[PDB]
Design a protein around this nucleic acid. Structure first.
Ligand SMILES: [K+]
Ligand SMILES: [K+]
Ligand SMILES: [K+]
Ligand SMILES: [K+]
Ligand SMILES: [K+]
Ligand SMILES: [K+]
Ligand SMILES: [K+]
Ligand SMILES: [K+]
Ligand SMILES: [Mg+2]
Ligand SMILES: [Mg+2]
Ligand SMILES: [Mg+2]
Ligand SMILES: [Mg+2]
Ligand SMILES: [Mg+2]
Ligand SMILES: [Mg+2]
Ligand SMILES: [Mg+2]
Ligand SMILES: [Mg+2]
Lengths: 50, 203, 155, 117, 122
RNA sequence: GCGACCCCAGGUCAGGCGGGACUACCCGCUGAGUUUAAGCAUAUCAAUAAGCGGAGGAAAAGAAACUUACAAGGAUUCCCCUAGUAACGGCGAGCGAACCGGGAACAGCCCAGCCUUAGAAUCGGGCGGCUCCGCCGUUCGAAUUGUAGUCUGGAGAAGCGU
RNA sequence: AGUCGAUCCUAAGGGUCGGGGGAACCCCGACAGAUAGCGCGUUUCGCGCGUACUCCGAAAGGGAAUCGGGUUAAAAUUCCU
RNA sequence: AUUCCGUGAACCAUCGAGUCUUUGAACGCAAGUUGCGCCCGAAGCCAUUAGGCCGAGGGCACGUCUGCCUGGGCGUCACGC
């Protein structure tokens, strides 16, 4: 809602920061196994459940 | 040379003097909280023979406990099981009242160590004990070789592990031989030893 | 606390007191008690300062004086153990018992022991006063084993 | 003693202020929220530049723990400029942004040029 | 131009504070340059300046703690932060002397009848 | 009104102690039924699972108010045997130790009470020193409603000799 | 965002000291009790009052205070005048 | 970056010095609140044996042990009036 607590807003900010693709240069690292961000979230697919 | 007189008098609990004194003391104790500190023991000689000393770091607390058996605490007295276990009343707690008093003192006074306790008074509804506790952090206690053993970590909460005199009594450890052997080192330890199926390498 | 301490006195008054405890309600008379305590005030044990002074004087005069003989002190005796021992050994000449010892089982038997040993005994008011005699907060009882020559007749 | 009140009240007794033999903490802690820690960096977005040009206002990203008084003091210490008013908000990314409007005596454009934005 | 720790230790408190202030100002300028599309050469200096600030703060803190320890030496009731940490159980332990305490009869027994050195041959 | 004591009250008084966390083993409490009995209620499952607490590097036990009846062993603990035995059991289903004997390891001790009374010889705190896990000096306090010392049944006190 | 709300108040109720129970996790909840403190003058001490919770509990109950005009790609009774 | 023949690189190793945000047994009161209180105080501003503004930073839970200060009650006494 428009009315939200400070703690919930900070948690949402962290969740937004965590919702991004991996840097391209990560794939060039020696002995790299990470292909993409497996923890990507979409607001319509999976709810945060707060 | 006076403690023997006091002990002999306290062995005469049905004498008029003792009855009067105990009646007054029981009335007074009934008016006070269940756990309260006493400045000095009311049974000096018994306290001495149980290890108390009149020096800093020793304290005595009077503890009041309720009398009677242990009613099974199930709602509406309903038991879901076979008739053998359907009993509710006439069941008895495996621990003695003085053990309960020592446990209450120890839990309430978490910063002290329970040493021993003794019976002082009782009415139909309540039984009274005084618990001797030791402040293991005091320098007087820590510098006394006869008692500073209580400061070692292995003796933490003796009362809650049955390591007091009452604990040894209710654990069945006050006797030795054919009438008490199953109690050593402990009843459950003996059961585990007896039930063990030993399968050696070369069978 | 006030209510309980008053009701305890009331209850003790109401109930019947057995003779052994009742004997402690009959203390020494005011004049006799005053005379006895005036006599006792001159047989007090030495205080800490006096004891230290005596010890240092003895140490200083030990080698120089070749350990001169000192007259045996005559002072009142205190402490339940020591008083009971002196009574049992028939060394005490007078036993002073406080009337307000709590627990009272510590001294309730003392009059009987004094009677059996034919030792005159008295019950006086105030364990605190007895303690003040011997530089202590309280004293359960006091004993006199001997008195000075100048005081024998009044004793 | 004469008592006129039936109700007993606990008497007032003297209390003593603490005079510890040793200090629990050896020395006072460091000032974490100093002027450099308060002011992270100026915002150089299009909206921030428009604010600087129009409303004589500087836009800063500030420590979330800083309040308006601390922001004003930090701005004064860092750049020696008075502030007419400070408006603050917490962005959706969790950082604090402050709209610092200077007094007419100070020019926002010159201050921005001195800062290097 | 690089900061040497051994050279910092030879400076006074005021000089260290002045250097810390200068380093903080340089770090703020570098942050401004970073937010204004600064060149990689300026960006690489952020790590160096942060390391210098950390080094100066560490030297100041160590000097202050050494001074406090010296001031509280040969004194009881030290500040809790200056007391030995060890572990809780170790801190609660009886001292060696307290552990070795014994009654008079035990001392007499050990003095009179200690375990003797003997052999069985003849 | 003053003073002594007693009990109790308020202190962000000076200095300390305690709560909580972990689970393989350890100590205390509480406590079933599934199941077996070809049904089932006593029994069995089990003095177990679940539940509530308390320690350590091990815990617990421990120096006989013991075992035995022998030509006697001698704290506690554990292993082998005793033994699927004595016993218990709708004497049904089932259940079930201990002593001797052989090994692993071994270790014994501390108090209360009558017993300084030519003086509490005992202990804590502050302060000042020192070869600072402690010792010394001084000053307050605890303690005679008893701290030190001796004694603990195997003895011991006292006296006399070596 | 001093002016819109939370924030303050108390409702049904919730959480508690002490006390009473409880092997214990815990149960009852101001009911077994030397309440918090509050005013006047001051050498900061004196005087006078003082019925055992000065805690949580409403973005719809109660309640200190803002209006036009303008402005953004996206904010406004909050930005500008 | 590094006198790379050296107080000296390292996404090296190891530990003695140091830093260690909000919480949590969690401790001023609370909590779907970065909400609501009290106390001490470095430096600085002008203010001068006087007090004001600000605030770095730190304190204020409970149960207990020893010691202490301040107190209450004819609870037990004694000396005076
Ligand atoms: K059954
Ligand atoms: K001393
Ligand atoms: K002794
Ligand atoms: K209770
Ligand atoms: K209540
Ligand atoms: K409202
Ligand atoms: K307007
Ligand atoms: K609130
Ligand atoms: Mg059941
Ligand atoms: Mg009241
Ligand atoms: Mg053990
Ligand atoms: Mg066979
Ligand atoms: Mg054997
Ligand atoms: Mg000393
Ligand atoms: Mg309670
Ligand atoms: Mg309110």
């Amino acid at each position: 809602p428009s009315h939200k607590t400070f703690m919930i807003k900070k948690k949402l900010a962290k969740k937004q920061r965590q919702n991004r693709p991996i840097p391209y240069w990560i794939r060039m690292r020696t002995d790299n196994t990470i292909r993409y961000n497996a923890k990507r979230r979409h607001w319509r697919r999976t709810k945060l459940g707060f | 040379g006076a403690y023997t007189y006091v002990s002999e008098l306290w062995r005469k609990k049905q004498s008029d003097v003792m009855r009067f004194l105990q009646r007054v003391r029981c009335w007074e104790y009934r008016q006070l909280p269940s756990i309260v500190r006493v400045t000095r023991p009311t049974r000096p000689d018994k306290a001495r023979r149980l290890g108390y000393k009149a020096k800093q770091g020793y304290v005595v607390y009077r503890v009041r406990v309720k009398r009677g058996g242990r009613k099974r605490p199930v709602p509406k007295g309903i038991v879901y099981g076979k008739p053998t276990n359907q009993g509710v009343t006439q069941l008895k707690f495996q621990r003695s009242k003085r053990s309960v008093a020592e446990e209450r003192a120890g839990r309430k006074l978490g910063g002290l160590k329970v040493l021993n306790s003794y019976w002082i008074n009782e009415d139909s509804t309540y039984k009274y004990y005084e618990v001797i506790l030791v402040d293991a952090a005091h320098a007087a206690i820590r510098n006394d070789p006869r008692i500073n053993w209580i400061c070692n970590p292995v003796h933490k909460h003796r009362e809650l592990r049955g390591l007091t005199s009452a604990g040894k009594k209710y654990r069945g450890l006050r006797g030795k031989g054919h009438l008490y052997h199953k109690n050593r080192p402990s009843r459950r330890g003996t059961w585990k030893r007896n039930q063990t199926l030993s399968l050696r390498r070369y069978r | 606390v006030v209510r309980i301490q008053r009701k305890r006195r009331i209850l003790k008054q109401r109930l019947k007191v057995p003779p052994s405890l009742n004997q402690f309600s009959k203390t020494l008379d005011k004049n006799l008690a005053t005379n006895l305590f005036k006599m006792l005030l001159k047989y007090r044990p030495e205080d800490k300062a006096a004891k230290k002074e005596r010890l240092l004087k003895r140490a200083q005069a030990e080698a120089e004086g070749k350990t001169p003989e000192t007259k045996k002190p005559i002072i009142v005796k205190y402490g339940l153990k020591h008083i009971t021992y002196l009574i049992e050994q028939n060394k005490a000449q007078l036993v002073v018992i406080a009337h307000d010892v709590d627990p009272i089982e510590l001294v309730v038997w003392l009059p009987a022991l004094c009677r059996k040993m034919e030792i005159p005994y008295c019950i006086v008011k105030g364990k605190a006063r007895l303690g003040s005699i011997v530089h202590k907060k309280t004293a359960s009882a006091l004993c006199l084993t001997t008195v000075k020559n100048e005081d024998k007749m009044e004793f | 003693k004469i008592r006129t009140k039936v109700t007993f009240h606990r008497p007032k007794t003297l209390k003593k202020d603490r005079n510890p033999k040793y200090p629990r903490i050896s020395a006072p802690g460091r000032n974490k929220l100093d002027q450099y820690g308060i002011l992270k960096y100026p915002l150089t977005t299009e909206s921030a530049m428009k604010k600087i040009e129009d409303n004589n206002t500087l836009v800063f990203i500030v420590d979330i723990k800083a309040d308006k008084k601390k922001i004003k003091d930090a701005v004064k210490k860092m750049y020696d400029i008075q502030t007419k008013k400070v408006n603050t908000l917490i962005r959706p990314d969790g950082t604090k942004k402050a709209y610092v409007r200077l007094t007419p005596d100070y020019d926002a454009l010159d201050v921005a040029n001195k800062i290097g934005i | 131009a690089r900061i040497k720790v051994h050279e910092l230790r030879n400076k006074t408190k005021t000089e260290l504070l002045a250097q810390l202030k200068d380093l903080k100002a340089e770090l703020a300028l570098l942050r401004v340059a970073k937010v204004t599309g600064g060149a990689p050469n300026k960006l690489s200096k952020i790590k160096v300046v942060r390391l210098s600030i950390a080094q100066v703060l560490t030297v100041i803190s160590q000097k202050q703690k050494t001074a406090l320890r010296e001031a509280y030496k040969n004194k009881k009731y030290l500040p809790l932060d200056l007391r030995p940490k060890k572990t809780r159980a170790i801190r609660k332990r009886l001292t060696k002397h307290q552990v070795s305490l014994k009654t008079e009869r035990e001392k007499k027994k050990e003095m009179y009848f200690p375990i003797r050195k003997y052999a069985i041959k003849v």
